[PDB]
Design a protein around this motif. Structure first.
Motif, PDB file in Angstrom:
ATOM      1  N   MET A   8      11.611   7.064  -7.420  1.00 20.55           N
ATOM      2  CA  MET A   8      10.868   7.894  -6.361  1.00 20.55           C
ATOM      3  C   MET A   8       9.725   9.124  -7.021  1.00 20.55           C
ATOM      4  SD  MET A   8       9.912  10.754  -3.472  1.00 20.55           S
ATOM      5  CE  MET A   8      11.744  10.971  -3.564  1.00 20.55           C
ATOM      6  N   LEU A  11       8.223   5.564  -9.204  1.00 20.17           N
ATOM      7  CA  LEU A  11       6.883   5.163  -8.090  1.00 20.17           C
ATOM      8  C   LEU A  11       6.395   6.074  -7.818  1.00 20.17           C
ATOM      9  CD1 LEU A  11       7.299   1.930  -6.947  1.00 20.17           C
ATOM     10  CD2 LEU A  11       8.279   3.522  -5.114  1.00 20.17           C
ATOM     11  N   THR A  12       6.142   7.323  -8.044  1.00 20.36           N
ATOM     12  CA  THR A  12       5.081   7.864  -8.320  1.00 20.36           C
ATOM     13  C   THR A  12       3.400   7.429  -8.800  1.00 20.36           C
ATOM     14  OG1 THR A  12       6.259   9.694  -6.385  1.00 20.36           O
ATOM     15  CG2 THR A  12       4.669  10.482  -7.398  1.00 20.36           C
ATOM     16  N   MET A  15       1.522   4.769  -8.662  1.00 17.66           N
ATOM     17  CA  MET A  15       0.655   4.857  -7.527  1.00 17.66           C
ATOM     18  C   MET A  15      -0.397   5.417  -7.949  1.00 17.66           C
ATOM     19  SD  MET A  15       2.703   5.883  -3.567  1.00 17.66           S
ATOM     20  CE  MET A  15       2.960   4.586  -3.019  1.00 17.66           C
ATOM     21  N   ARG A  16      -0.002   6.499  -8.463  1.00 23.86           N
ATOM     22  CA  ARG A  16      -1.217   7.768  -9.322  1.00 23.86           C
ATOM     23  C   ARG A  16      -1.822   7.394 -10.455  1.00 23.86           C
ATOM     24  NH1 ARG A  16      -3.841  11.554  -7.806  1.00 23.86           N
ATOM     25  NH2 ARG A  16      -5.115  10.455  -7.599  1.00 23.86           N
ATOM     26  N   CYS A  19      -5.056   4.546  -8.428  1.00 23.33           N
ATOM     27  CA  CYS A  19      -6.400   5.787  -7.820  1.00 23.33           C
ATOM     28  C   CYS A  19      -7.147   5.573  -8.940  1.00 23.33           C
ATOM     29  CB  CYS A  19      -5.560   6.788  -6.863  1.00 23.33           C
ATOM     30  SG  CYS A  19      -4.624   5.804  -6.079  1.00 23.33           S
ATOM     31  N   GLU A  27      -6.194   6.793  -2.508  1.00 18.71           N
ATOM     32  CA  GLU A  27      -5.755   7.260  -0.608  1.00 18.71           C
ATOM     33  C   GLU A  27      -5.928   6.090  -0.245  1.00 18.71           C
ATOM     34  OE1 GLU A  27      -8.063   8.812  -2.309  1.00 18.71           O
ATOM     35  OE2 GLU A  27      -6.345  10.110  -3.318  1.00 18.71           O
ATOM     36  N   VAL A  30      -3.657   2.273  -2.463  1.00 20.87           N
ATOM     37  CA  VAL A  30      -2.307   2.180  -3.202  1.00 20.87           C
ATOM     38  C   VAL A  30      -1.402   2.050  -1.557  1.00 20.87           C
ATOM     39  CG1 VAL A  30      -2.485   5.049  -1.991  1.00 20.87           C
ATOM     40  CG2 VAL A  30      -1.047   4.288  -3.521  1.00 20.87           C
ATOM     41  N   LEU A  31      -2.166   2.470  -0.613  1.00 22.99           N
ATOM     42  CA  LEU A  31      -1.491   2.605   1.078  1.00 22.99           C
ATOM     43  C   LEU A  31      -1.032   0.605   1.431  1.00 22.99           C
ATOM     44  CD1 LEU A  31      -0.170   2.740   3.810  1.00 22.99           C
ATOM     45  CD2 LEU A  31      -2.613   3.212   4.895  1.00 22.99           C
ATOM     46  N   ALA A  34       1.554  -0.712  -0.884  1.00 21.08           N
ATOM     47  CA  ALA A  34       2.691  -0.236  -0.741  1.00 21.08           C
ATOM     48  C   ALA A  34       3.168  -1.394   0.033  1.00 21.08           C
ATOM     49  CB  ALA A  34       2.894   0.853  -0.007  1.00 21.08           C
TER      50      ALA A  34
ATOM     51  N   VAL B  37       0.414  15.808 -13.016  1.00 20.20           N
ATOM     52  CA  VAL B  37       0.248  14.931 -12.405  1.00 20.20           C
ATOM     53  C   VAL B  37      -0.619  15.191 -10.737  1.00 20.20           C
ATOM     54  CG1 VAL B  37       1.224  12.979 -13.029  1.00 20.20           C
ATOM     55  CG2 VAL B  37       1.927  14.291 -11.055  1.00 20.20           C
ATOM     56  N   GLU B  38      -1.248  15.036 -10.735  1.00 20.08           N
ATOM     57  CA  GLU B  38      -2.059  15.243  -9.694  1.00 20.08           C
ATOM     58  C   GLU B  38      -1.449  14.715  -7.933  1.00 20.08           C
ATOM     59  OE1 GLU B  38      -4.442  17.317  -8.232  1.00 20.08           O
ATOM     60  OE2 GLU B  38      -5.541  17.325 -10.395  1.00 20.08           O
ATOM     61  N   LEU B  40      -0.903  13.186  -5.017  1.00 22.91           N
ATOM     62  CA  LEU B  40      -1.900  11.806  -3.643  1.00 22.91           C
ATOM     63  C   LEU B  40      -1.663  12.371  -2.285  1.00 22.91           C
ATOM     64  CD1 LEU B  40      -0.317   8.834  -5.684  1.00 22.91           C
ATOM     65  CD2 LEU B  40      -2.661   9.855  -5.950  1.00 22.91           C
ATOM     66  N   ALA B  41      -2.766  12.340  -1.574  1.00 22.54           N
ATOM     67  CA  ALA B  41      -2.100  12.880   0.153  1.00 22.54           C
ATOM     68  C   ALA B  41      -2.086  12.013   0.427  1.00 22.54           C
ATOM     69  CB  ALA B  41      -4.082  12.886   0.726  1.00 22.54           C
ATOM     70  N   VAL B  42      -2.028  10.479   0.122  1.00 23.22           N
ATOM     71  CA  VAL B  42      -1.368   9.564   0.615  1.00 23.22           C
ATOM     72  C   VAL B  42       0.437  10.194   1.433  1.00 23.22           C
ATOM     73  CG1 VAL B  42      -2.744   7.629   0.709  1.00 23.22           C
ATOM     74  CG2 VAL B  42      -0.910   8.167  -0.921  1.00 23.22           C
ATOM     75  N   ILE B  43       0.986   9.899   0.192  1.00 24.86           N
ATOM     76  CA  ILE B  43       2.284  10.452   0.626  1.00 24.86           C
ATOM     77  C   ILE B  43       2.548  12.305   1.175  1.00 24.86           C
ATOM     78  CG2 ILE B  43       3.952  11.198  -0.925  1.00 24.86           C
ATOM     79  CD1 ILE B  43       3.003   9.365  -3.556  1.00 24.86           C
ATOM     80  N   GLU B  46       1.218  10.171   5.291  1.00 29.50           N
ATOM     81  CA  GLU B  46       1.562   8.956   6.007  1.00 29.50           C
ATOM     82  C   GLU B  46       2.786   8.521   5.709  1.00 29.50           C
ATOM     83  OE1 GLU B  46      -1.158   5.660   4.667  1.00 29.50           O
ATOM     84  OE2 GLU B  46      -3.002   6.703   5.762  1.00 29.50           O
ATOM     85  N   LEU B  48       4.644   7.428   2.913  1.00 24.80           N
ATOM     86  CA  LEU B  48       5.230   6.043   2.673  1.00 24.80           C
ATOM     87  C   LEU B  48       6.488   6.390   2.330  1.00 24.80           C
ATOM     88  CD1 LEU B  48       2.149   7.250   1.496  1.00 24.80           C
ATOM     89  CD2 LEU B  48       1.911   4.976   1.175  1.00 24.80           C
ATOM     90  N   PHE B  49       7.524   7.437   1.963  1.00 26.10           N
ATOM     91  CA  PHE B  49       8.901   7.602   1.306  1.00 26.10           C
ATOM     92  C   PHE B  49       9.672   7.450   2.255  1.00 26.10           C
ATOM     93  CE2 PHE B  49       6.702   8.798  -2.488  1.00 26.10           C
ATOM     94  CZ  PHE B  49       6.892   8.123  -3.309  1.00 26.10           C
TER      95      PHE B  49
END
Lengths: 51, 50
Positions: A8, A11-12, A15-16, A19, A27, A30-31, A34, B37-38, B40-43, B46, B48-49
Motif C-alpha cells: 500500500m 502503491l500509494t 497514485m500520487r 495526479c 482525485e 486515480v479512482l 484503480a 508526500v501529499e 490524496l483525498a480519494v484514499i 472512498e 480504495l484500500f
C-alpha cells in the motif's frame, strides 16, 4: 501485515505520481485507474506552444 | 579614520557601488533525509484500500 503495508505504501506513491503527472484530472483519474477505467479525452484543453 | 574624497562632489558619500556574486559547492556529511508526500483525498474517503 507488513506485506499489505510495503505494498500500500508503494502503491500509494504510484497514485500520487498520476495526479501530478496527469493534471486537471486529480482525485478522479486515480479512482478510475484503480477500477480499470478511463476518462473522456476530448474535453480537456492542451498547450500548443510556449516561448 | 577620515579620508576625504576630494575629486567627488560629496566627501562623506560612499563613492563605490559594489555587486557581489558568490557560488559555493560544499560536499558535507549531513544526512539530507527524505521528502514526504501529499495526501490524496480519494484514499480514506472512498476506501480504495478498504
Amino acid at each position: 501485515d507488513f506485506y499489505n503495508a510495503q505494498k500500500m505504501d508503494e502503491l500509494t506513491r504510484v497514485m500520487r505520481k498520476i495526479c501530478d503527472d496527469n493534471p486537471e484530472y486529480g482525485e478522479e483519474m486515480v479512482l478510475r485507474w484503480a477500477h480499470g477505467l478511463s476518462v473522456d479525452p476530448g474535453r480537456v484543453p492542451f498547450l500548443l506552444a510556449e516561448k | 579614520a577620515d579620508l576625504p574624497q576630494y575629486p567627488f562632489a560629496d566627501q562623506q558619500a560612499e563613492v563605490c557601488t559594489y555587486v557581489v556574486q558568490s557560488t559555493a559547492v560544499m560536499p558535507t556529511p549531513m544526512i539530507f533525509g527524505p521528502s514526504p508526500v501529499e495526501q490524496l483525498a480519494v484514499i480514506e474517503t472512498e476506501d480504495l484500500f478498504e
